[PDB]
Motif scaffolding. Structure first.
Motif, mmCIF file in Angstrom:
data_model
loop_
_atom_site.group_PDB
_atom_site.id
_atom_site.type_symbol
_atom_site.label_atom_id
_atom_site.label_comp_id
_atom_site.label_asym_id
_atom_site.label_seq_id
_atom_site.Cartn_x
_atom_site.Cartn_y
_atom_site.Cartn_z
ATOM 1 N N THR A 150 0.829 -1.202 0.000
ATOM 2 C CA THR A 150 0.000 0.000 0.000
ATOM 3 C C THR A 150 0.865 1.255 0.000
ATOM 4 N N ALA A 151 1.919 1.261 0.818
ATOM 5 C CA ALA A 151 2.862 2.378 0.801
ATOM 6 C C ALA A 151 3.541 2.499 -0.559
ATOM 7 N N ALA A 152 3.877 1.361 -1.172
ATOM 8 C CA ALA A 152 4.467 1.385 -2.509
ATOM 9 C C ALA A 152 3.506 1.992 -3.528
ATOM 10 N N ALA A 153 2.223 1.631 -3.447
ATOM 11 C CA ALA A 153 1.225 2.221 -4.335
ATOM 12 C C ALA A 153 1.082 3.719 -4.098
ATOM 13 N N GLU A 154 1.155 4.154 -2.839
ATOM 14 C CA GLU A 154 1.122 5.586 -2.549
ATOM 15 C C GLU A 154 2.309 6.304 -3.184
ATOM 16 N N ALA A 155 3.500 5.709 -3.087
ATOM 17 C CA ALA A 155 4.676 6.301 -3.721
ATOM 18 C C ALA A 155 4.509 6.366 -5.235
ATOM 19 N N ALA A 156 3.944 5.311 -5.828
ATOM 20 C CA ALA A 156 3.689 5.313 -7.264
ATOM 21 C C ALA A 156 2.713 6.418 -7.648
ATOM 22 N N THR A 157 1.666 6.615 -6.844
ATOM 23 C CA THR A 157 0.714 7.692 -7.101
ATOM 24 C C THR A 157 1.393 9.055 -7.025
ATOM 25 N N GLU A 158 2.259 9.249 -6.028
ATOM 26 C CA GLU A 158 2.980 10.513 -5.910
ATOM 27 C C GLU A 158 3.858 10.763 -7.130
ATOM 28 N N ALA A 159 4.581 9.734 -7.579
ATOM 29 C CA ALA A 159 5.416 9.883 -8.768
ATOM 30 C C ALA A 159 4.573 10.215 -9.992
ATOM 31 N N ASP A 160 3.420 9.556 -10.131
ATOM 32 C CA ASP A 160 2.534 9.837 -11.256
ATOM 33 C C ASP A 160 2.064 11.282 -11.236
ATOM 34 N N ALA A 161 1.662 11.778 -10.064
ATOM 35 C CA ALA A 161 1.199 13.159 -9.970
ATOM 36 C C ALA A 161 2.311 14.141 -10.319
ATOM 37 N N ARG A 162 3.520 13.905 -9.800
ATOM 38 C CA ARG A 162 4.629 14.815 -10.082
ATOM 39 C C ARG A 162 4.964 14.838 -11.570
ATOM 40 N N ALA A 163 5.028 13.662 -12.196
ATOM 41 C CA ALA A 163 5.395 13.607 -13.604
ATOM 42 C C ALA A 163 4.291 14.181 -14.490
ATOM 43 N N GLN A 164 3.025 13.991 -14.101
ATOM 44 C CA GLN A 164 1.929 14.614 -14.835
ATOM 45 C C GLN A 164 1.991 16.131 -14.728
ATOM 46 N N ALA A 165 2.342 16.648 -13.550
ATOM 47 C CA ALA A 165 2.531 18.088 -13.413
ATOM 48 C C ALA A 165 3.642 18.579 -14.331
ATOM 49 N N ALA A 166 4.739 17.823 -14.417
ATOM 50 C CA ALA A 166 5.839 18.216 -15.297
ATOM 51 C C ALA A 166 5.394 18.263 -16.758
ATOM 52 N N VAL A 167 4.679 17.228 -17.209
ATOM 53 C CA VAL A 167 4.270 17.202 -18.612
ATOM 54 C C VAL A 167 3.251 18.302 -18.902
ATOM 55 N N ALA A 168 2.365 18.608 -17.950
ATOM 56 C CA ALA A 168 1.426 19.708 -18.151
ATOM 57 C C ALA A 168 2.150 21.046 -18.232
ATOM 58 N N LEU A 169 3.165 21.244 -17.386
ATOM 59 C CA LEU A 169 3.951 22.471 -17.450
ATOM 60 C C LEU A 169 4.633 22.611 -18.806
ATOM 61 N N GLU A 170 5.192 21.516 -19.319
ATOM 62 C CA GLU A 170 5.872 21.609 -20.606
ATOM 63 C C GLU A 170 4.880 21.847 -21.743
ATOM 64 N N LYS A 171 3.694 21.237 -21.665
ATOM 65 C CA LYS A 171 2.651 21.537 -22.641
ATOM 66 C C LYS A 171 2.285 23.014 -22.611
ATOM 67 N N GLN A 172 2.226 23.599 -21.414
ATOM 68 C CA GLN A 172 1.974 25.032 -21.306
ATOM 69 C C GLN A 172 3.083 25.835 -21.976
ATOM 70 N N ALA A 173 4.335 25.405 -21.811
ATOM 71 C CA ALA A 173 5.441 26.092 -22.479
ATOM 72 C C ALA A 173 5.299 26.030 -23.999
ATOM 73 N N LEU A 174 4.943 24.855 -24.522
ATOM 74 C CA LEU A 174 4.711 24.719 -25.959
ATOM 75 C C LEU A 174 3.600 25.652 -26.421
ATOM 76 N N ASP A 175 2.515 25.730 -25.650
ATOM 77 C CA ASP A 175 1.420 26.621 -26.013
ATOM 78 C C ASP A 175 1.846 28.082 -25.972
ATOM 79 N N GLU A 176 2.732 28.447 -25.044
ATOM 80 C CA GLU A 176 3.271 29.805 -25.025
ATOM 81 C C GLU A 176 4.049 30.100 -26.302
ATOM 82 N N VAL A 177 4.878 29.147 -26.731
ATOM 83 C CA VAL A 177 5.625 29.328 -27.975
ATOM 84 C C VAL A 177 4.664 29.508 -29.143
ATOM 85 N N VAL A 178 3.625 28.672 -29.201
ATOM 86 C CA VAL A 178 2.654 28.762 -30.289
ATOM 87 C C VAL A 178 1.926 30.100 -30.258
ATOM 88 N N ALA A 179 1.608 30.593 -29.060
ATOM 89 C CA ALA A 179 0.907 31.868 -28.947
ATOM 90 C C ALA A 179 1.767 33.014 -29.460
#
Lengths: 63, 73
Positions: A34-63
């Motif tokens: 269960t603790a391992a699954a919690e760590a996996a969830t935390e990693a997923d959230a962090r990496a999703q935040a990173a990819v969303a931030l980079e998508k925002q950067a791409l959209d800034e370039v496009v704008a």
């Protein structure tokens, strides 16, 4: 007209945001996994935040 | 990214000159440099997205076998 500065602020913003995205780029057994699954969830959230931030950067370039 | 349509874009990409040529071409609006930036950002966003897909599949597997362990007990 000369696009001398606007490219420069674009570069500064996109470089800082790329750096920030790269920053986030990196019965008892039941409880342990269960603790391992919690760590996996935390990693997923962090990496999703990173990819969303980079998508925002791409959209800034496009704008 | 699809490799067939990305090999072509890599070929048409590496053949670009230095940034000085792409600057002196259209000094009003540096379209070439901005298109290069768009291509680079598309590549990198796609890479992180596939990383997301893999890690999310791993997380789903973790949830599934945790549920299985709960059901076994």
């Amino acid at each position: 007209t000369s696009a001398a500065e606007a490219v420069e602020e674009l570069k500064a913003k996109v470089a800082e945001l790329r750096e920030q995205a790269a920053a986030e780029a990196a019965q008892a057994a039941i409880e342990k996994l269960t603790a391992a699954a919690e760590a996996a969830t935390e990693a997923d959230a962090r990496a999703q935040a990173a990819v969303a931030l980079e998508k925002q950067a791409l959209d800034e370039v496009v704008a | 990214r699809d490799m067939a349509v990305w090999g072509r874009v890599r070929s048409c990409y590496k053949a670009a000159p230095a940034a000085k040529k792409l600057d002196a071409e259209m000094p009003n609006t540096l379209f070439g440099s901005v298109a290069l930036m768009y291509i680079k950002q598309v590549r990198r966003v796609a890479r992180k997205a596939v990383l997301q897909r893999e890690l999310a599949a791993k997380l789903a597997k973790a949830q599934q076998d945790l549920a299985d362990k709960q059901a076994a007990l």
